[PDB]
């Protein structure tokens, strides 16, 4: 029934064709040769940065179900990258250029009940339309919505919490109802607020009069006593079930996930639930490396989990709306989010960027973003742009900023607007920074003090920071890869130590958002900016951040200990403990106290309190680091060993049990070890993979930016000792999935993944 169903998946059973072909929108077109696949789908991750432009066609053929007779029928696309045209039974019903905002088509008038129907989508992504890897295809989920003629249209519930206290929160709810009948009506609304255990704990009644053919809105509120407060440690989520009634008859059911938290900002900082919050933040691009751009919940969850292990409490969605699923995870995992709309406005950064669409589409797209995301408790700011060229239009650039900021204020005043500024002092002197609620600075720690003198009333944070580059496990002593000593970057870049320093000296700054948390795909086809590599393996940079951003005692040592006798090895230790002591084959090499024994790093040079360092003449064997508190008590330790020749493969699944849904993944780390089980720190052995039983091979990676190996062939070379196998369940198939990893001259490895549900 249409009254109980709130939008089901329309992802299954499509036809795809990469390339231009005449008349493929037509009912009678013959797509029998076309490849068969389920959405979501990124075609650009398959081919051989990686080519992302051209033409792609999708067609789905379906019977008009008898239950859809006299119903309103819509197809929702969360994302199609990019330049979409859509047809139903040959009639054009949709056209959407921007690939990061979703859109909806109404197929009610053209739907044929009991006969065949053909939904056709053409994507024409252009070259030079993105500064990073966008993907190509219907890369986000697609939804079928079958409603009765009185119903809640898309983004039709808006949930706010204008009072949030320990004793009582007030939940305010705006309901939008569409009356597609030929009669005026008064309709009842029942809001059921449902807790984490599935029990309805409060019901709020409302109603609305809507004339025939029209849409109406109504507002009501309800008290929640002793509420479960959404916070970073305890990210408690409620579920709102909204039911529409026409007299005794239910006409529609509509669900909204929401949380209960208050946010507040002054010129001196940001506040969550009445407490100062600081952003230990990361920028992330939307791809998931070997998995490409197609939405995958587990891929995103893993990425966010790894970021939380680093001490990350905040995300900047550089530089576009993310998927809804990504934001659902942030909600569930207690991360605060800066939800960013655009990378350029009226002035072009790239030839076929958003400036082509800005005048016609900017209001519609920003409106669509805020309407889509204004119920996520994770979202705390609307970022209207990143590094936009209008920063240097002295006379008029501020007007475009105001225009976008006013739309933020009109649609959702419960969250501040912001923007990421890379020019200095331009947008501060040109009246631009003042048009948003909170100003973000990109790569300007040296100017933090000065901008506060000149513009003391602006709230501030580092919207983009560091841009330090490294390759995982690569050290250049004394290139095509970059040193993992974390010194090098582009002209505006600087090591993390510099941001930490200037964050401490400028407490008003709300925090930072590093470029980037994970490596991402480009247009060397991928990045080096990530603290974690493209397949989810932490670089040494991860531990530098972890040492600064977490309390749980840790210690990490670099580099590896496969060197030549005679070399002097600079040895760096990152810890959150008071001091550390280095031991080479049992012999002490000295204590070093953090904040006292400083490490000089080249930028001219900086004395950093954030690294501990030794100069060690290389004798082979084992190098052990011990971290202590200020009483001398051992709190953590790590040991690294000079490894021998590659002898064996070890396989480490992140999860030995996965869901039998056809989408869920196990990420199996692949190690190249010597005879004693020590990792071979520079190994590049080709590993081959075989997957049998309940599931299949999905993808491989190694975090190497400068390779052309496929992400989707069952073979991959190690990089700096490791690579990564990704397997996936088959839908509704339980049991064992058996993996075998082989490599010429090494001991074969096996592991089993169990698949349930
Ligand atoms: O260091 C490179 C970064 C500069 N800021 C904008 C990002 O998208 C990226 O290009």
Residue numbers in the entry: 46 to 93, 104 to 533, 542 to 586, 607 to 686, 694 to 847
What is the paper's account of this structure, in its own sentences?
determined the three-dimensional structures of these four agarases. initiated by GH86 or GH16B, which generates NAOS. depolymerized by GH86, and systematically saccharified by the exo-acting GH117B and GH2C enzymes. exo-acting β-d-galactosidases, while GH117A and GH117B are α-1,3-L-neoagarooligosaccharide hydrolases.
replaced with W657 and C598 in GH2C, respectively.
